[PDB]
Subunit: 455 residues, 4 copies
């Protein structure tokens, strides 16, 4: 088919709904393989849908066109036009290409929906109709916040709660299992496995509130700011109304940004929101490491806990259960850390009225959310729910450490108690064996004094 | 002073300069960790002293310390706080990851000094003891983390925040003052639709206001103190009311809302509160970077740049005024960005019951606070308060741009307006010149029609 | 179809060539959307091909099977089986899943090629045949280096040279155009546009040698190290031979790693090689920024150069040419910076005999190469080749700056010359206008003294 | 000293402490940039002095400076180098991005001191002048970059490299010593096939050897000096032989292969050489992090960890030996990682003819060199030289593992061997116990067949 724009005409694949501007970009921005993610495409479609409704309400668009555009939008949301967005993330910094991609796809489809044809003889026009009362400048940032807030609310937060609930049950289930504490990787005083796990729980609980604190700023929308933030060429009620419409159809508390200049010139809300995410990544990294070290073995590591074997193993090598879910989680955590740096440089690089590092910022942000959400779900289902204590190993280690000598101090002078600890350590004996051989006490009184369950 | 004093510890005797208040352990660390030049920050030292001062008071209250010994330790700490012993802490940041060595440094200095205060002498025949008295009811494991938060919270509340509010106020005043000044907008570095200088500056204001909220949201997690958790978090070897009492004392003497950490395992095993708080700081750094850049580009020139504004020339090519304050600010913003990565790595590396990357983490965190607070204070007083518009240059730019043709649309139609824009662009003429050459309107009409103030 | 392994049987989609282990992973590692990139799949196929050949040579594999496997491998290289590798990057840290994915696909296809069927009744066995004399431990790292070295040699380096050649021609073409230099964004002494561009050229030339210095370490292969690096269960000549085979079929100087322990336990070669890449990213970022700032305008920026308008523009807004290729390049540069951090954390996180952060490291590495290579190509073709000087603007600015007063010093006292500079600056006049009004000289002698083309 | 001295510059007169050698400009910077506590590194100060010393000699050689004045400046610099004026440089790192203020600091100190050396007095009636004499034939723009490379190259060659070679030698000796000690391998933290301790350590050796080469490859770019490029790189206002001559002088007095930069525009506009050199350093940091971690995990215990090796206990829970040197090393490795990001951001931010992020960049670079050099020196002398194997623990681990069953295959077949492994694993028995319980072999046969030394 032959589609055209100001620069003239250009042939586009007949079976496609996109136009000339999308085709040119497809030839000018052939960089790597990353394209806009589905969540962003949906957010962009939702933004066009709400814009169509409000424009209709203000009498700027005919009902016939308004409804057709919204219908084409719903088809995108339904997953009917995934193959219609071939543009790379590495395009113009404002995301203008992707805005045009949606305008053309929506206009062409909306034409067909009105008994028309796709292309040059279309009834609905991409710029004049679909992009009415908008600008690439304020539409893309809006799409970014819609996608981000929805991903955080719908995917990340629920998965975070679920994982916490599981670990919380585990904490309670193992509340009485006393184990040897470790600081600097060295044997220290005892604590219960339940207490150790409760530490992971509190970490996740704290992260949740931190992530929630970032939502309000992300809920602010640029729509209405127009080209530079002044709102020139828009109805005074447009910005507030469109924010309302979007809130209504997504069930999220979106609001119009109090300052459009800040909304257009920066990616601050995302730079901040992502800070909470890298915070979550550091916490998960620690939890994952504890799990895999505690399950290390089966014979030459710590082996205090056991996790489910998900992958098939060698017949001649029973016991080697690699903590794959832990390896997948730690890897994605490193990724979030890196994504943060990319976002920071982009967020700090805005100039004057517009920050033009947007596609890259949203690409990294959405990926982090995806990684963290799916990562917690997988870790939860394929590992966390199955954490079980190797009670024997736990006790063996507890009764093998010299750390329990403390209980004896209250019943025998610091030096005498420490005296048996020196012998046990030196001779390679256990505290009891050394205590009995040194004749400092009897088995009966020893056992009654060294009460690990009493801290 | 060449004269030494023989001090001793569990490992034996070692020589310490006679004129110094530290002991055996501090001397060993000093000789074992000769790494680089970074030592503990003055703020951290003072926080450690405040912690010991509070621990003493409460130990006295619980009758664990003799009133005389307690008051002595308390008085010695106050001298540290008054800046009388800044030279008594020579340990490098690069020491044991728990900060144990610096805890001992404070214990030894406080003991040797309290001894003298009790009519005693410093050294191995001191009246007050480092471990038995000064470190009573505490652990290196829970003391350092506590000092970290005390220092962090106070620096944020007393240094960072006040400076942020001040810069914000200044920019807000500038915003109101230049509200009527219309200038050319710039998107993608290209000329764009007009906006007032006041509106552009209001964007910086909103950025700073948003940053304040984010910083405020990170405070309650930092206010949580680990004191009471002892070695592994269980609180073994501590009076049940200690944690709460010591946290209350701290709150009282600092006037900061400190509270004991609900979960001590999370407090000892991680630096999560700081990883998250620093996330807000790197956010402020990204915003500051953008503001500083806008300021220097807008003041670039004097003849071959943008030159829309003028900034105070603070140092000794006639009109060549380098934006030095802007250069210091952008440089420190990059530092905060790198500091975030160092903090993230340390935060994600906790193992079991204790995170041993603490000195490095607090070192980077407190540096970022100093950099941001002082940077904003400097930028504000040496640049921000004196920003002035170059009204003539601004107006010259507006009248030379092709972006004002939009005002002609309603009078002569879009087609003729676009023709004028094209002519002016192709022939290197101003909009008025092109309009007149074509004869589409009179100069009087142009002057009455194109009013940039109605953008 | 029903495929099975040690854990039992599992149904796999009939029209697919993968087996049970791939199907289980597909259900256990449902994280995000990133899969192994084509270049890595090819490298893995090439590794299996070379392994099959050598195994045949050493008499470990029958000619019938050896040749069939190599044939199945060539089909993968031919792009016939892209849809056969559905595994996510976020899998087991050693890349075992992906190794099994290739073994199963290759075994199944190799069976069909031998008149057999795919599945349980296959003639060629994934583990026993395709993975003969190998381990997931030494195969994945080998695939990583093959993919990395080939991407650097075949894609990155050629694009780097091409871009340099173009800029080099430009430097030469503009060798005589004198322009105003800028330091701190302020007007400074003059230099030619050719000189400024030659700076970009030297930057690229230096980067090339830096990238070349990293190749030798990347050329070292782990194959032969087997499970822990000892080479247990392998023929002594295996490692060297397979390295040779791989060198032969790829035409790259691959060699067997001198130390297999270093090869297995770390990702050091990549951490180092990537360091050169982030170095290249910082250089490109600077070059891209200079281009877009120099082309800023058309009327209110610098506008010293003009670049090609690739995207269609508004009829009523001629002149607004957004530097899109520059925006795409700067965005991907920020990405490489972030990718480096992720790679660093992964490369630093190895434990004992094996680094298990591999899939994430190679994912980031290959993406950086792709971004940089395609980024330079696009920047070159759609921008660099079209850089043209706006000679008029350049001269206007040159004859408008006060910087030329220096030429007068040699003909008139420092103070007198500076005297006219003060007037020009203060009155807003040009150096000549001020010089003539101040009566310090005549137009003739002025023009003969102020020779900008003589530096 | 309360007494002041009146010094003056183009901006006027200002009071300087009478007891100090600096001047008016240094005093203004001191009062305008009160930011944080970081000042120029001693190494950088000395490099700046070396640069001025060389500039003087060559200026004398070209008859641009009077022999008397030249020798005086030269003698004053030597005092700085001898450490006699460390207190004369109070300027913060956070100053003008070109490092102009610190250049002036050295000019003023050198002038005031050279004056006295000529029988003159310091102050506004000095015999030697800061700008006219000490800064002769130079520019702040080309002097600071030069000082940066002098400092960088010397620190790498005299501090970093020697320490690296020393640690490598030590580890190599340990490798040869423990060559016969067979231990259990670990992949994914799980027990794996055996390897000798010497082989595991040889991996650390090869890592360090590879790092040395990478570091060496980055040196020639750092050896390139910008001196001669002047303000914008053209070399305007300089004797044609200056650049080469001054570079030769520097080379002679330092014995380092310094050479003038072939392209001065690349030298002034970027910090590329340092961005690249630091890339090799972050690589060494990742390797060191892995080695330090291996060491601390391998020494973990004494009863509930791995405990395969023992390290020197350097400071004053009997056998509880914290791996403090390991903790300092890992902490500083995270610092180098963050420093790389700060350096990258500054390196990527050059604008036109000059990069004004220099102080921050050199600050981070020299800190990384200090950290790595001192860290390796400390780790080597306080840990590495004393690493000893716990032969009994090692052997206990081997005999308790299921990984040795492989040796039975050739004698009793794979099926029976796997059965023994399964039995032992399910019932918590050693391989010998399971083998004997089944009656598949005699204890004598087990002892003769399973020889871990033949792994
Ligand atoms: O990226 C573009 O080319 C662009 C697109 C639009 C739009 O979609 O309408 C607008 C606008 O009219 O607001 C402005 C710009 C711009 O350059 O700033
Ligand atoms: O670094 C130390 O050596 C240390 C010191 C103390 C202390 O404060 O005395 C304690 C404690 O009893 O809480 C714990 C440790 C430890 O190693 O975990
Ligand atoms: O990841 C695995 O499950 C794995 C796979 C293989 C293999 O492909 O053969 C081997 C090997 O025999 O070398 C070892 C391991 C391991 O755990 O280290
Ligand atoms: O920072 C400065 O003020 C400065 C100082 C000098 C100098 O060394 O005197 C020069 C020079 O002539 O090379 C350039 C500059 C500049 O602003 O670009």
């Amino acid at each position: 088919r032959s589609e055209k724009d100001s620069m003239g005409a250009i042939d586009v694949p007949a079976d496609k709904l996109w136009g000339a501007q999308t085709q040119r970009s497809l030839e000018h921005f052939r960089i790597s393989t990353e394209k806009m993610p589905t969540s962003l495409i949906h957010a962009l479609a939702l933004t066009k849908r709400a814009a169509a409704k409000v424009n209709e309400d203000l009498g700027l668009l005919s009902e016939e066109k308004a409804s057709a555009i919204r219908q084409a939008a719903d088809e995108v949301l339904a997953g009917q036009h995934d193959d219609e967005f071939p543009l790379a993330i590495w395009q113009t910094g404002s995301g203008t290409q992707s805005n045009m991609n949606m305008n053309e796809v929506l206009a062409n489809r909306a034409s067909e929906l009105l008994g028309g044809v796709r292309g040059m003889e279309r009834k609905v026009h991409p710029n004049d109709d679909v992009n009415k009362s908008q600008s690439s400048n304020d539409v893309f940032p809006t799409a970014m916040h819609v996608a981000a807030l929805l991903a955080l609310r719908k995917q990340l937060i629920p998965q975070l709660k679920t994982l916490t609930q599981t670990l919380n049950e585990k904490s309670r289930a193992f509340a009485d299992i006393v184990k040897i504490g470790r600081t600097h990787l060295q044997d220290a005083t005892p604590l219960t496995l339940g207490q150790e796990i409760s530490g992971w729980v509190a970490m996740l609980e704290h992260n949740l509130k931190h992530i929630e604190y970032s939502l309000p700023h992300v809920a602010e929308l640029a729509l209405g700011g127009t080209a530079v933030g002044t709102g020139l060429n828009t109805h005074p009620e447009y910005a507030r109304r469109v924010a309302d419409e979007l809130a209504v159809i997504t069930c999220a508390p979106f609001v119009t940004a109090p300052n459009k200049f800040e909304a257009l010139a920066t990616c601050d809300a995302l730079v901040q929101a992502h800070g909470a995410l890298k915070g979550l990544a550091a916490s998960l990294m620690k939890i994952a490491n504890d799990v895999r070290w505690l399950a290390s073995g089966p014979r030459c590591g710590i082996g205090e806990i056991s996790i489910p074997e998900n992958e098939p193993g060698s017949s001649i090598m029973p016991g080697k259960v690699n903590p794959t879910q832990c390896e997948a989680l730690t890897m994605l955590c490193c990724q979030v850390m890196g994504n943060d740096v990319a976002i920071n440089m982009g967020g700090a690089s805005g100039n004057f009225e517009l920050n033009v590092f947007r596609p890259m910022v949203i690409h990294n942000f959405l990926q982090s959310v995806r990684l963290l959400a799916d990562g917690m779900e997988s870790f939860n289902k394929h590992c966390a729910v199955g954490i079980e204590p190797n009670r024997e190993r736990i006790n063996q280690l507890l009764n093998e450490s010299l750390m329990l000598v403390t209980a004896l101090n209250t019943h025998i002078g610091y030096d005498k108690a420490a005296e048996i600890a020196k012998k046990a350590h030196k001779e390679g004996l256990t505290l009891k064996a050394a205590a009995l051989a040194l004749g400092y006490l009897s088995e009966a009184e020893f056992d009654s004094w060294v009460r690990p369950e009493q801290m």
